[PDB]
Curated annotation (Swiss-Prot), chain A:
Source domain of life: Eukaryota
Residues of the full protein shown: 1317 to 2221 of 2222
Extra information: In eukaryotes there are five DNA polymerases: alpha, beta, gamma, delta, and epsilon which are responsible for different reactions of DNA synthesis. Present with 1970 molecules/cell in log phase SD medium.
Cited function: Catalytic component of the DNA polymerase epsilon complex which participates in chromosomal DNA replication. Required during synthesis of the leading DNA strands at the replication fork, binds at/or near replication origins and moves along DNA with the replication fork. Has 3'-5' proofreading exonuclease activity that corrects errors arising during DNA replication.
Assembly with partners or alone: DNA polymerase epsilon is a heterotetramer consisting of POL2, DPB2, DPB3 and DPB4.
Motif CysB motif location, chain numbering: 756-773
Gene name of the encoded protein: POL2
Protein name per the record: DNA polymerase epsilon catalytic subunit A
Subcellular location: Nucleus
Species of the source: Saccharomyces cerevisiae (strain ATCC 204508 / S288c)
UniProt-annotated binding residues for Zn(2+): C700, C703, C722, C725
From Swiss-Prot, chain B:
Leftover remarks: Present with 3110 +/- 251 molecules/cell in log phase SD medium. In eukaryotes there are five DNA polymerases: alpha, beta, gamma, delta, and epsilon which are responsible for different reactions of DNA synthesis.
PTM annotation: Phosphorylated in a cell cycle dependent manner during late G1 phase. Phosphorylation may facilitate the interaction with POL2 or the activity of DNA polymerase II. Phosphorylation is independent of DNA replication but dependent upon CDC28 in vivo.
Localization per Swiss-Prot or TrEMBL: Cytoplasm; Nucleus
Phosphoserine PTM sites in chain numbering: S460
Similarity section: Belongs to the DNA polymerase epsilon subunit B family.
Protein name per its UniProtKB record: DNA polymerase epsilon subunit B
A GO MF label: DNA binding
Gene: DPB2
Length: 813, 536
């Protein structure tokens, strides 16, 4: 208890609001103590004085700032009256606006993990009997060495599965009895685990493992051995070291503990919460167990948090705890609401608000995309830490604006994180990454939609500033998507790019608002044909070539190879034209002005031959397997002539060049003359055969990468896994977020505003046949738009077999 | 009763001579063949079926009222109706009547589209995947219809009880300082001052020096009856007295609508009197499947009710402690999977009691913490016409039992001639927060809330900016008939049961008040209710 950190603050409420477990590492040995904590409420006495004084004096006005849209009401037992003292008399319990923070949370926010009971021996003895009240005891102390030195463990990893193998395994520091030809493979991994244990002893220095790993092969067939055998084993382990160990529980679901095991392991708990090939998983997990123990030690040494922080995104918990500490240093109310993803905005958070609902589903990030052919050398520079740099440089009435005081608090917090990351601090940079990945997390214990909307808008404006800076630098932008930028440098020569690129990136780095922004060139494009993210091609470093054409999937299998082959032919045509133009010399008019002529005669000759071939085999069977239009998620266009679709696609890709527009139009007209179709005919006009269905603000649960996952245009390989890494994604998460966007669109359509059909004045009343100017009322979101969205969702669900999405579609009608 | 098959050609002369000649009924070949088969089955030698055909035609003319009875459904319908009339008289059937044929539950998408013609009529209106989406005109008229219904209630009740009339807002312009009474939807303008909206127009009101009725809750979005003096100088209505429109009895609406038949009404009354012993058990609010103490209490209650399974067992909203949403994690947090496992655990803990859930229909009501209604609202008051719980989570629950219904949050039941409306919502908190003050205990507050709810004639007399509503599915929330039994489930209001204007309102409250798993019981035959508090 004396300068002793509790490893676990597990809720030993026992029905008492303030009684809880404190397993403080006392000087001799860890000791379990009870506490007593009043529940402070932030109900500021806004221009109204209540002399009621039910149980505890309430601070007037709380000396704090409320939430626009040192402990008042320090009551001990809120359960005295659930109605409390509701008056609604000028903000006296009229709007709660306090703290729902129960025990185990108010303590962490107020009392540091390491604490010393500064009382005499008699007072300490008195407090031992009933507990340590936070009002007069448990003052925070410094966390120079918050963790311990050498403590026993209770490693009980478990990896259940439905195949038929049970992984109810238990590990002891000295027993080494792992109760589940496993020894041979265990030694196979031990071959490198000697080096791993050397790393542990030179870096962790916490625990050591016996080398005589004996494997007990017992079939946990039924609960007699699944739980009861495990229950007796765990109580034997508990009595072996009486309250002298830390349980290391690994289980995808924790209920097994809470039934009977949790109280059988009242010693401090850490919940990791993570056939012959599957046997290797057990040995890898047991032999990697001594690696993250020192990581947790470092985390609890730096962050003033106990060892009870739940391991599933524990860094989010660290963010919430640290921000709560910093906000308690300030005199500002909180919006914790641990129970619900909503913030604790009093009682007003449970009713519908137009602005709040709109800022919930406001994730449309502007994209800059320019379709064309650019003989100039264009650089693909990938940005990173854009959100971090944005929140750092944000320093450089409005009901939609977040609390600027909390904004400054977050800015200082991020500043200290950043300049700790500059020096040796892995916790700091992990924390800044987690804050980047954390603002948009509803599960956050301090999440606020207004804060997320503010951060999104700030990132938008920072990207706009970066685009303006690059434009002023002398490199036009053809792509910008918050994750990468394509800059069209005017330097024609591929050789004269490296020095120019270095000068450009130095000039960008000189900008104060982008000093923390980091960038790196991904690829150099002497030649590039660009439409969108998923439909492009060209030469990258000048020697490599890439071709990512999703529209090729929309063509018949007979004509897809023809599409690809003629695409490389035309690419070589523009490459030769650019080379000749540069050789002669060394947009209104660029290096490409007659590249079509390199293939004009071959192109239309091959088109005529393919037209005759198709006309011969359009109706004759056994060729329809070739003249078949493949079905894609974005399929919304009916193709009567696969050859016509092919030629329209080629015409659209070769129309990208602005300088050769006339010659490309002439070639298209000549090609259409083969079909005897007019040049400007509507059927002759090409349109995108693929729709789009993006999932905004998709986050990779491993590398914390923010992306927007398309499905009607993005390839299936690009949707089930991340980009920067190659880790996969959860099907359940994909379906959840797709249904989330679907229901959000449905609600937005149902909550839209009306406006006039003639002067476009927004409808502002409720009873009106039309606008006073005789203009019919109309919604901003058309019903046809929602119909198309529902059709796209149904097509995606059917194509990818999304069961829950199909269930949602069935629920709709 | 001798079974036989008779061919259409021989019965055709007599069948024609009866149906077509006697009363003008067109007979088709398929209908003739099916009727011949039926006649042969229910009589041998096909001689004395003349009474049967006469009964068929008379019932068809009295009920169907069209021609071409040979469509396999007019024939089958008249045959079945003859079956029930023979059964109640106590052939093909001589059994007794069953309430299951007269008991039904109506979802928000299964109600009758009742659009009230503004002059004098309450008409009936009754296509693809996106065929349920409400149209812009529906958003326009979702409050037009509410205004018209409340106006009908006013012009039927107030004038006959109290007789200075309602002056349209548009007709208040040229009058300088006269006295006026307006029935208008109270709201706050975009300028931020109080006013009343009306199809004729809107008038800004001087809310000062106004004395309202103290037995009502007044909020933005509810339509009130203000009275005062208009001023053209400020173009403002200085209001002095204000009240909610007076309510009306259920039978007053029934006599206006004129919707029942006489035989059906007599059968329903006979079943109401005979079915004296039928128990309806209502569970509390917020049955959190995540809370272990809640499963302990629910196991105790399920065991207690397994002794005597009631007629119905309704389940109220917010079945989980945390609102559902798209949860990002690599573990089993996955609120969809967690909610499905919660229903699976409920099914496992509920299949243990065979006597329960048999001869008993259990209905589930969505809430602020339910899938497809909370996954975007995030535990806030989202769309009011909440859709039923998706079947993707109800595989094991429905597999356990045989009569499980997942119904809308404001659902309707036609168990008898009486209609029972179920509604789970914390209306008390919204009313208290949004109640506007006047510059001018618990039972009194509940009386005020119920009086506001009934007098307004709407389940949630609130602005769509305060609680979104499906535009087409608004008649589901209108209290047009004022049905007798209101299942007004709430969590921020104390448990109570009160009657007024011939309507019964029950608020069982939250499932756990302090330490007890409170649930409610109702007997429709006696129309008598009783609380059930069971300690944990
Ligand atoms: Zn990734
Ligand atoms: Zn207009």
């Amino acid at each position: 208890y004396a300068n002793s950190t509790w490893e676990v603050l597990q809720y030993k409420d026992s029905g008492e609001p303030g009684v809880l477990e404190v397993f403080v590492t006392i000087n001799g040995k860890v000791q379990n103590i009870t506490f007593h904590i009043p529940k402070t409420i932030y109900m500021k006495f806004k221009s109204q004085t209540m002399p009621l004084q039910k149980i505890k004096n309430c601070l007037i006005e709380k000396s704090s700032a409320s939430l626009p849209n040192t402990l008042p009401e320090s009551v001990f037992l809120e359960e005295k009256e659930n109605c409390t003292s509701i008056f609604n008399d000028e903000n006296v319990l009229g709007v709660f606006e306090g703290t729902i923070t129960p025990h185990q949370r108010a303590i962490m926010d107020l009392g540091a993990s390491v604490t010393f009971r500064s009382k005499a021996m008699g007072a300490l003895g008195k407090g031992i009997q009933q507990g340590f009240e936070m009002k007069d005891l448990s003052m925070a102390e410094n966390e120079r060495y918050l963790s311990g030195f050498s403590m026993d463990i209770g490693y009980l990893l478990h990896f259940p599965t439905s195949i038929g193998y049970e992984f109810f395994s238990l590990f002891k520091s000295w027993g080494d009895t792992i109760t589940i030809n496993a020894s041979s493979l265990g030694q196979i991994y031990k071959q490198m685990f000697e080096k791993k244990k050397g790393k542990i002893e030179t870096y962790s220095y916490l625990v050591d493992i016996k080398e005589d790993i004996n494997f007990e092969f017992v079939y946990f067939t039924d609960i007699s051995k699944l739980y009861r055998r495990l229950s007796q084993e765990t109580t034997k382990l508990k009595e072996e070291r009486g309250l002298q160990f830390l349980l290391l529980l690994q289980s995808p679901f924790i209920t097994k503990l809470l039934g009977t095991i949790r109280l059988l392991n009242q010693m401090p708990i850490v919940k990791l919460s993570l056939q012959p090939t599957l046997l290797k998983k057990l040995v890898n997990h047991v032999l990697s167990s001594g690696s993250w123990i020192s990581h947790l030690i470092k985390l609890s040494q730096y962050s003033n948090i106990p060892i009870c922080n739940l391991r599933l995104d524990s860094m989010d918990y660290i963010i919430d705890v640290l921000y709560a500490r910093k906000l308690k240093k300030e005199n500002i109310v909180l919006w914790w609401n641990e129970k619900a993803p909503l913030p604790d905005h009093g009682g007003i958070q449970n009713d519908f608000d137009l602005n709040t609902s709109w800022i919930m589903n406001d994730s449309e990030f502007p994209k800059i995309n320019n379709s064309g052919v650019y003989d100039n050398v264009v650089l693909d520079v990938g940005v990173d830490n854009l959100t971090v740099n944005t929140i750092l440089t944000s320093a450089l009435f409005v009901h939609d604006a977040f609390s600027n005081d909390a904004l400054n608090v977050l800015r200082g917090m991020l500043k200290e994180w950043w300049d700790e990351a500059l020096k040796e601090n892995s916790t700091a940079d992990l924390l800044v990454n987690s804050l980047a990945s954390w603002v948009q997390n509803p599960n956050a214990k301090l999440f606020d939609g207004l804060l997320r909307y503010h951060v999104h808008n700030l990132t938008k404006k920072a990207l706009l500033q970066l685009v303006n800076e690059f434009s002023a630098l002398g490199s036009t932008i053809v792509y910008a998507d918050r994750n990468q930028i394509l800059i069209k440098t005017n330097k024609y020569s591929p050789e004269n790019c490296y020095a120019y690129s270095q000068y450009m990136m130095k000039a960008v780095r000189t900008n104060p608002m982008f000093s923390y922004l980091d960038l790196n060139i991904k690829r150099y494009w002497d030649l590039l044909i660009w439409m969108d993210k998923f439909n492009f091609s060209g030469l990258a470093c000048d020697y490599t070539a890439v071709s990512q054409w999703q529209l090729k999937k929309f063509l018949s299998p007979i004509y897809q190879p023809e599409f690809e082959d003629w695409m490389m032919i035309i690419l070589d045509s523009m490459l030769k034209t650019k080379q000749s133009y540069l050789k002669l010399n060394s947009s209104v008019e660029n290096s490409l002005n007659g590249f079509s002529h390199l293939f004009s005669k071959p192109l239309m000759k091959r088109v005529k031959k393919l037209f005759k071939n198709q006309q011969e085999f359009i109706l004759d069977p056994q060729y329809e397997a070739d003249y078949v239009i493949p079905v894609l998620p974005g399929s919304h266009l009916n193709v009567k002539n696969p050859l016509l679709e092919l030629v329209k696609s080629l015409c659209h890709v070769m129309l990208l060049s602005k300088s050769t527009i006339l010659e490309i139009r002439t070639l298209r007209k000549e090609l259409l003359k083969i079909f005897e179709l007019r040049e400007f005919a509507k059927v002759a006009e090409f349109k995108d055969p693929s729709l789009s269905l993006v999932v905004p603000d998709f986050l990779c649960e491993y590398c914390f990468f923010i992306s927007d996952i398309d499905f009607c245009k993005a390839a299936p390989e690009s949707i089930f896994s991340c980009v920067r890494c190659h880790k996969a994604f959860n099907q359940v998460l994909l379906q959840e977020h797709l249904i989330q966007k679907l229901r959000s669109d449905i609600e937005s359509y149902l909550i839209q505003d009306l406006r006039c059909s003639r002067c476009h004045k927004v409808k502002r009343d409720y009873m009106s046949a039309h606008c006073p100017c005789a203009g019919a009322w109309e919604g901003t979101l058309p019903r046809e738009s929602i119909v198309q969205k529902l059709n796209v969702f149904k097509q995606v669900a059917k194509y990818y077999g999304f069961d829950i999405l199909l269930s949602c579609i069935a629920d709709l009608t | 009763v001798l079974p036989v098959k008779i061919q259409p050609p021989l019965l055709r002369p007599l069948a024609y001579r009866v149906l077509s000649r006697k009363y003008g009924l067109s007979i088709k070949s398929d209908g003739l063949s099916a009727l011949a088969e039926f006649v042969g089955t229910n009589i041998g030698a096909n001689w004395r079926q003349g009474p049967a055909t006469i009964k068929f035609l008379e019932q068809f003319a009295a009920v169907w009222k069209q021609q071409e009875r040979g469509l396999f459904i007019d024939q089958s319908g008249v045959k079945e109706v003859i079956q029930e009339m023979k059964e109640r008289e106590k052939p093909e059937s001589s059994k007794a009547l069953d309430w299951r044929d007269y008991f039904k539950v109506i979802n928000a998408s299964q109600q009758q589209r009742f659009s009230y013609n503004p002059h004098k009529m309450q008409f009936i209106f009754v296509g693809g995947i996106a065929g349920f989406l409400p149209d812009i005109e529906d958003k326009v008229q979702m409050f037009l219809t509410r205004y018209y219904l409340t106006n009908d209630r006013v012009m039927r009740n107030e004038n006959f009880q109290n007789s200075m009339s309602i002056t349209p807002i548009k007709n208040l312009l040229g009058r300088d300082a006269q006295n006026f009474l307006l029935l208008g939807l109270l709201n706050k303008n975009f300028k931020g001052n109080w006013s009343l909206e009306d199809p004729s127009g809107s008038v800004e009101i001087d809310i000062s020096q106004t004395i309202p009725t103290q037995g009502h809750y007044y909020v933005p979005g509810c339509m009130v009856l203000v009275e005062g003096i208009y001023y053209s100088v400020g173009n403002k209505f200085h209001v002095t007295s204000m009240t909610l429109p007076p309510g009306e009895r259920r039978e007053i609406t029934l006599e206006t609508i004129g919707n029942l038949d006489k035989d059906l009404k007599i059968r329903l009354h006979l079943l109401e009197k005979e079915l004296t012993d039928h128990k309806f058990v209502i569970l509390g609010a917020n049955l959190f499947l995540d809370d272990l103490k809640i499963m302990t209490a629910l196991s105790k209650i399920l065991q207690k009710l397994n002794d005597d399974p009631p007629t119905l067992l309704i389940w109220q909203g917010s079945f989980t402690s945390v609102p559902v949403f798209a949860s990002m994690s690599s573990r089993n947090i996955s609120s969809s999977t967690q909610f499905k496992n919660n229903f699976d655990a409920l099914a496992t803990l509920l299949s243990r009691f065979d006597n329960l859930t048999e001869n008993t229909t259990m209905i589930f009501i969505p809430g602020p913490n339910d899938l497809w209604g909370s996954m975007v609202s995030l535990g806030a008051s989202g769309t009011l016409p909440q859709d039923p719980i998706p079947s993707a989570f109800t595989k094991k629950i429905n597999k356990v039992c045989k009569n499980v219904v997942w119904s809308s949050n404001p659902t309707r039941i036609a168990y008898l001639s009486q209609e029972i409306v179920i509604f789970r919502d914390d209306l008390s908190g919204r009313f208290k927060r949004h109640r506007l003050e006047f510059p001018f205990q618990k039972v009194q507050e509940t009386r005020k809330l119920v009086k506001t709810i009934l007098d307004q004639g709407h389940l949630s007399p609130f602005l769509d900016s305060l609680r979104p509503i499906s535009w087409d599915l608004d008649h589901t929330l209108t209290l047009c008939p004022i049905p007798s039994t209101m299942v007004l489930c709430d969590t921020t209001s104390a448990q109570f049961d009160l009657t007024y204007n011939g309507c019964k309102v029950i608020n069982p409250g939250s499932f756990i008040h302090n330490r007890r798993a409170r649930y409610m019981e109702y007997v429709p035959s006696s129309k008598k209710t009783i609380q059930e508090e069971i300690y944990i």
